[PDB]
Symmetry: C2
Subunit: 238 residues, 2 copies
């Protein structure tokens, strides 16, 4: 199995893109830590993931809480003797809020809407990247994936969404910059939008997973580090 | 006086760029609300500002706290009968941390460093923009200025700094997009870096202020809305 012996962490894995990626990583033979706020939900994904192969470890982690993120990566370190190969920073937190407030302007919606979209979905990504990079850098290898979209380039849906996406693409680029000399890669993946109402999803989440497995097993992964990667192009590459 | 009758809010006004802008706005005859965590410090700036002209109103506001931002704009609404012409979203919060951690990588510094740079300096800007826009939109005019830098384009200093700057430039663009039909402008000003150790400052902070007065009194300001504006170019324009 291609990812036998490898260790992954996938955030926002209870549904959608994160769940699709967790499933493909386990299918490739990895041990995959999956996170979310609710253990029961994660266990159902884990049952399905582990059925495809590898191992799947539900961890309750609200990534808006730095101490919970620390706890997550302490567990990984403890259980895997410091090994971490792949971190997928993914968040569905806030997408439902985006949907509910369609066609309301940023001054019409509550100011706190920022936190529904850019806490777990930006701030949490930074926290995870810090703790994950701490495990990768000593090994001289590893891959951090930030899930983003064309909202990084232009107005899309609403203000906090687009600002968050600009920030996520930059997070990938700037982390890549610092990590390169240590042999660790960081990319921004645009897997396409699962929530089509925003704009098959089933097919799409599976494709996203296959892309992450492809990236994680590419000997030339460092050459893509710091780039934006549309998932459709990766399909063609691989 | 060019800005007689006008009402401004300048965040991070205790020193540096924010202080320079507050001073020039008062000199132009505006009423300027200035914010910060410490009233005593703000009062000293206000004494100097009000000496140049206009009026200067210190308001204690930790913009990481949404309820404090609400309170700030409630005061403005109450005291000025709903009038707000200019909001300058400016933050020096975190710059000293950037300096102290020079040449330490994002995984070497604490994860919480994100909050030193991108709480008041990103999240707070969103909160202020929401509450300020609520006052501007009914009037069909007004100007929101986001202070940013070339760190929006490329790696600069450290990860959270650059990510924050990418987010700030996007915040200006996306707010501009929604505001345009209501006649309200939003721009990203790159005034140059006051903290030169990062890379005269005195001259620079005064220039930044003069630029904001120029922008705020430009009948064609909407044509610049959504753009990045280097302060040196605005000098030439005005």
């Amino acid at each position: 199995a291609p990812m036998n012996g490898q260790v992954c962490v996938v955030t926002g894995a209870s549904r959608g893109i994160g769940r699709g990626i967790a499933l493909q990583l386990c299918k490739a033979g990895a041990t995959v830590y999956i996170t979310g706020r609710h253990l029961d939900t994660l266990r159902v994904v884990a049952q399905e993931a582990q059925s495809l192969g590898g191992q799947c470890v539900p961890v309750v982690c609200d990534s808006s809480q730095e101490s919970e993120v620390r706890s997550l990566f302490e567990q990984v370190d403890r259980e895997q003797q410091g090994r971490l190969d792949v971190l997928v920073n993914n968040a569905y937190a806030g997408v439902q809020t985006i949907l509910n407030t369609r066609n309301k302007a940023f001054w019409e919606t509550p100011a706190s809407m920022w936190d529904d979209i850019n806490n777990v979905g930006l701030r949490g990504h930074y926290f995870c990247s810090v703790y994950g990079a701490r495990l990768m850098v000593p090994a001289g290898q590893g891959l951090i994936v930030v899930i983003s979209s064309p909202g990084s380039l232009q107005y899309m849906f609403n203000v906090p969404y687009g600002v968050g996406k600009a920030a996520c693409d930059k997070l990938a680029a700037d982390c890549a910059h610092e990590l390169r000399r240590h042999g660790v890669s960081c990319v921004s993946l645009w897997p396409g939008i699962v929530q089509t109402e925003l704009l098959s999803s089933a097919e799409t989440t599976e494709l996203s997973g296959k892309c992450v497995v492809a990236l994680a097993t590419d000997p030339n992964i460092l050459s893509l580090s710091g780039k934006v990667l549309p998932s459709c192009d990766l399909a063609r590459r691989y």
